[PDB]
Symmetry: D2
């Protein structure tokens, strides 16, 4: 299993990356990137913890002990082992704040494994290139070298004004093929953790009128010549004492510029078929969406805890008004958790025999989180009061003359004044900080319930009078069904 | 297995029942009560349906074919057989509108079976009376006679007069104990289906300061001398053509008066111990609470169906704003269902080996429905538009001169004019009649479903910082957990 | 000023009215309709009350004393006198439950008075019919004869049936034209109080591709031969003691069928011009929309009062969790009231010199009621608890042997046990009867979601970046605007 | 009228203030503070602009031209002139983001002016002192020297420890009564802009069982010996090109500690009486609450604008689902504005002849904002998409090789790619930074808006059944009203 130290070294590979105005010499070391880079290191080192060997690792089919990240769930029971693996990672690293650690996006490659043939036999202009072997090859490399391969699938909003038939810029497209590979030019909008990966997982989602020279699926090293990762600015805090979570690292998002970059045939999985990009890219995001639900449920759990802690510390916890508000937080958690459990119980098997959770249920589970996060945030903030705003710094607390005033301001029915600040600082980082803010934003444009969901229900499912919801009502109304 | 015929006959036993201003001579026959009575009769006859023998009946341990209402789930799979039993009943009778058919409240008696001794052992003032044997005797009678025994547990609201503690409350209490039994005087409030039972299941839920003599658990014949069942006025409709659901029967709710009622020792399960009334009465309500959720999930399913039907018939189903609203109804059902399924997967076993669903989850599931049901039905009413209001009556539709106008008014893309009226009539019955409005109040007649459920749970498990919710937040805040 | 007796007698004119399957011989005396009929009578008699002379009547410009329903406001103060007139009617008649009493819809005719000629000169196919004198004549008749003229504007639902081009719709249309007048055939849908008017106010609203032959504005007697008023079934209760409100009358809604009805030229205001129906029919609903808001603010006030009465009678009013819930109701009333007041302070004058309230503000006020009334219903019901459901009849309350149990059950800190039943009966009528339910549907139809509220705003106002909301944002963003 | 320069120089007076760990040598010049200080300076310079003399200044009673912040409204029209003054300030300075510029809290001193004597006559422990003259003295000083005097009323949370809420509080209390003044020791919990005022307005709000020794009202210089202003860490951004709003200054919040400071008698307004602290501190906060509402209506206006702009630039504005959402935003602003209008129309006069707005209405107005602010934020962000996240810094946009790609990326149906970035940056600052998050918290921190607002309301208005809401419901229920 890869080591954190090894991960950090592999970052200094001459990849060209900007964080805002600032060009980055070495992601592992630069003040704007090093902290998150060290979280990914932390991710790898976690798997060497003797006490975590059972939850984090398994003996693979080749006799090699690996991260359960690579393990395939065969049934619901298997899926709970997988979930427990993911939850252990999240609980350990920054209060489950990071959504694109390696286990999150790496598992998406299993959709290829489920049926590698289709990706080659459905390519347009793939001639006699062995794309199927390209899949098998990378899956082995990915797994055995324990690589980190972030997703780069999102396209620009694509000009909603011009003649769509003339699709020039800014989308990434094949501008020429040769005997050695293809050349691509354009950009990938919104990619998370691109600067911190070994390879990037280039792909796309179907949209009506998608050219075909734009249907590209590949995995290329991050430092492939002609690639520039332009990151938004980093929101990491420099004072760990004042910001226990925000100072731990910003999971950067970026737009990736491909400047006529050459992609060897060996690194391509599929090209050219808009029809194939319909539904197959969709499956690629299944495990990502499932992982998000896991993260969401843990977050709901954290908020309940924070609410119970801050509220017991101040001594308002036994007020009917307060407890009723805590009840809403518990409700929210139980609602999130129920979508998670129900989805895991109503799953199915992929071609590769992998047991997949029910997408209808976990996708609505995600919609439920997005639609109510504002509500619960407001409740936590209301319960915390000034504890998330008027936080005395260490210098003020430790002051000889006035330090004792702060101790008195924060003392409660359970003593331990320090705890008020500790709790308040977590709530602040989470909800009153740039860093905490991007944690809405992340899962936000990713969905938009009303919008996406019903464009994402009648896609694999049937929400018509002839579907499952039509039976009972029809019978009750005395109308024939079927 | 009892027939509806036998059931109907058992109603004419001299029970004293008021419906509004009138004393009812025969509940089975009276215009105000006969319809619901025939719904219970229908419940019984259903089990004799040759094609329903598998879902509805089983062979008991004594080699007797009985209703599956008497069957014990011993694992999750068995629980789903139980639920399928209940759902078959629900879908078949008045669109799952009735909440206290015999299978809903009869199974709560297994709570006694799980551990009969404790009810006697914990009694105060009932020594030498064989309460344990009383339990076994009634369980046997209830089952073998196939009796219907509604719960009568709900107490009068507390009188908040400053001087309340210096006079009698209206609550039911033991007023005398004798060699033959106990004399009982007072009121049980908001009882559902009392007038239609063979026996009533007398009991109480704990409240701070509840006196020993008010703690009574027993089952007595509905027609016990001194018992008067005061029902609310009946909202049953007379025209089945215009009212397909509301004409099928009104599940009456009652205030039961006990005028110095004599109860033989043989009908008594427990008396005198407030401490016992803490956890145990909650166990009795578990199974009925779980049944309510089953019914609530079907109702959510019905609502989505009606929305899809009426929305497709009018031709508004295609509009994106309309699709989004139908989707959020799908969301509601999915959330209800998720609670149901999650509670079934995380259940536990009683001392009697019976597999119970998770009360934390299904009870918060109930609270989710109760808090949202009005908002949800408003969406349905809004989507149906004028079709739930401007409904042509049969005579207007059949009118030789003007009927054709109504056919045109109700014609849409689907091209079946009659259907719009069929759907309009069930929506109207469900949410625009007094019969329909009853469904909002009879299970939510106290203050705040969410908090009520939350307060009940923290008397059953730890919702404090020392409980399961404090662990993750404590860790994150650097606070010790134990 | 017309008397109630005069109104009642005018109803007996051989008009053809169905209520459900029942043909009505006289709307004034029939069991299904007499009660609402008597509410309109009450409306008239109210104006003869000496003590009410000031708020209800004024001396007209001809020196005759008439109801202030005919009085014109010329400024903000004048609008207040008008509203005070409306509110006094509403408060007097059935808790403000009726929304189409004569003063509500009669005043819409002043739309014609603001500019009568335009209706003439914009007509197509009415050359030489002096529709202007027609207008002036009816306006005088309307007022001096003190008639009641309900609106009949609404059209059958836009359905794309099998062939909405090969076959004709149910819409009212000009079928033939003569030297005497016009012949119309078709239907007006969802009219309110039609069966109770002396005349009906025929009109239409614009709709993409509406035929000129369907554009018709007129006022004809209700008993005009060939006219049939088909009412939905009546929901009025037969027992005033148990239903203090729902027994007072049902403001019926109807479908009006015109079987080749002849309208004399002298009863026509405009025909034939789709362009005219684009802006003027909306002006007609302006005053009714304003009256709707007034009724809504009142209803919010009623609801607050009910919550305060029931919570005080029970004794929970001082509980912090109850105070907070009641605050929500007060918040809703104040929000409704704020829109009301703000619209009156920011109005404008019509050509007729009449001061109109701000439509943007009072229409959004209306939308606020529609979007929050379920939440308000829910909040009141939750506070009232069992009192709105478990209501003892007079017979039960007065029973000699068991009646005293109900006194004890309903006793509280403020004594007067009977009051709890009184309050509960009002709440039950308002929210848990057929009659109460239609007071939801009154507006539960007049606009698909918001597919017609910003398409009815952005296109009827600026509501663009160049509009009034674009100024501040543009500045702050350092952009354009100008 | 004071000058920005003059104000800046007044700051360097040896006041001891910390921003986090940093002791501040000069509030006017320090990097953590100078930006907000220059905003207060901007506030003063605004008054000297010739183009704004009309709206910002007036000739006072003494003949001297002054800022309209010192002007008294004597009627509704006058109040509107005052509102136009405040809004002009807000719209000019950082998009109305600052809530405690001098005009916001300075006007609260008019409370004293309304009735000066009562503050002395009600004092306890100051027998023989003339305090009334002090009010007139400071009032003159305040106005003529054009001083800035922030509020400092909020006390430490009354922790239910035992001896923390008993005597040994951090609460500011009178420890010593000299014949030259008093000596005070303790803490003022939360204070906004204290470190930026010439004086601080010391005061307190009543709470059950508050000592008379903690009831102190006064105005002392900020650089008084023994006073330390401890500020939370500052959230000011460094780069105005990336942060157009957040770089403009952080309106800091403080805990002020009084280590045995001596207040001269000529600065005391009242001491010793808890009964006085009941209603009079409420009147102090009246004008502040009104100003907050003015500010909240502007922000709601701003939010609508941003939503329109971004939605139009992306070309998503025509979508029915989107325009529906924008209409909700317009509804929020309309609702907020209506509370504002209505409060101004239903005000009253103070003893001093000042026309004050209606507090019941503008306080429920504030509550409406506090409750909905989170949801409307979410809608803005969801509408903006990646624009508020994936923002190309200046350097990336200007880049010679790649810049072009960002231009094509932000191109929309309306061109002007740069605008997407400009709007996006404004939104990010508002809701995705800590500077922004402070704004939706600093508002409410005391408890629950709707409840507390209503709790404070029951004190000013009669909200019982004997109150104004009891009338209508009582008549409807047949209950006597008095």
């Amino acid at each position: 299993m890869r080591t954190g130290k090894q991960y950090l070294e592999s970052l200094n590979d001459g990849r060209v990356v900007w964080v805002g105005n600032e060009k980055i010499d070495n992601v592992a070391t630069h003040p704007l990137t090093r902290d998150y880079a060290e979280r990914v290191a932390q991710f790898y080192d976690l798997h060497h913890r003797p006490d975590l060997q059972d939850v984090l690792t398994f003996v693979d089919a080749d006799g090699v002990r690996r991260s359960r990240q690579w393990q395939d769930p065969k049934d619901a029971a298997g899926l709970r082992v997988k979930r427990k693996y993911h939850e252990t990672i999240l609980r350990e690293i920054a209060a489950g704040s990071y959504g694109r650690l390696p286990d999150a996006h790496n598992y998406t490659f299993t959709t290829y494994a489920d049926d590698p043939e289709v990706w080659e036999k459905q390519s347009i202009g793939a001639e006699g290139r062995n794309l199927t072997q390209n899949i098998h090859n990378f899956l082995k490399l990915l797994r055995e070298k324990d690589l980190n391969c972030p997703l780069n699938f999102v396209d620009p909003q694509t000009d909603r004004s011009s003649d769509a038939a003339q699709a020039r810029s800014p989308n990434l497209r094949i501008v020429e093929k040769t005997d050695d590979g293809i050349i691509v030019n354009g950009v990938k909008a919104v990619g998370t953790g691109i600067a911190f990966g070994d390879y990037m997982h280039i792909g796309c989602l179907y949209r009506p009128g998608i050219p075909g020279e734009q249907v590209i699926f590949a995995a290329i090293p991050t430092n492939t010549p002609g690639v520039t990762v332009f990151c938004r600015e980093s929101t990491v805090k420099n004072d760990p004492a004042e910001h226990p979570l925000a100072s731990q690292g910003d999971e950067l998002d970026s737009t990736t510029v491909f400047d006529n970059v050459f992609i060897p045939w060996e690194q391509v999985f599929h090209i050219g078929n808009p029809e194939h990009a319909k539904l197959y890219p969709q499956r690629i995001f299944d495990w990502v969406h499932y992982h998000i639900l896991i993260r969401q449920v843990l977050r709901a759990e954290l908020i309940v805890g924070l609410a119970i802690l801050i509220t017991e510390h101040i001594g308002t916890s036994k007020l009917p008004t307060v407890s009723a508000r805590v009840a809403k937080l518990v409700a929210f958690h139980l609602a999130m958790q129920a979508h998670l459990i129900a989805s895991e119980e109503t799953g199915f098997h992929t071609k590769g025999g992998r047991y997949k959770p029910n997408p209808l249920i976990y996708d609505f589970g995600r919609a439920h989180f997005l639609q109510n996060q504002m509500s619960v945030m407001y409740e936590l903030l209301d319960l915390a009061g000034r504890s998330s705003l008027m936080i005395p710094s260490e210098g003020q607390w430790d002051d000889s003359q006035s330090g004792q005033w702060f101790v008195k301001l924060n003392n409660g029915p359970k003593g331990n004044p320090r705890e008020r600040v500790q709790i308040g600082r977590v709530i602040r980082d989470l909800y009153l900080t740039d860093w905490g803010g991007r944690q809405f934003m992340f899962e936000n444009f990713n969905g938009t319930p009303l919008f996406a969901v019903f464009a994402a229900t009648m896609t694999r499912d049937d929400m018509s009078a002839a579907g499952t919801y039509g039976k009972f009502a029809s019978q009750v109304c005395g109308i024939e069904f079927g």
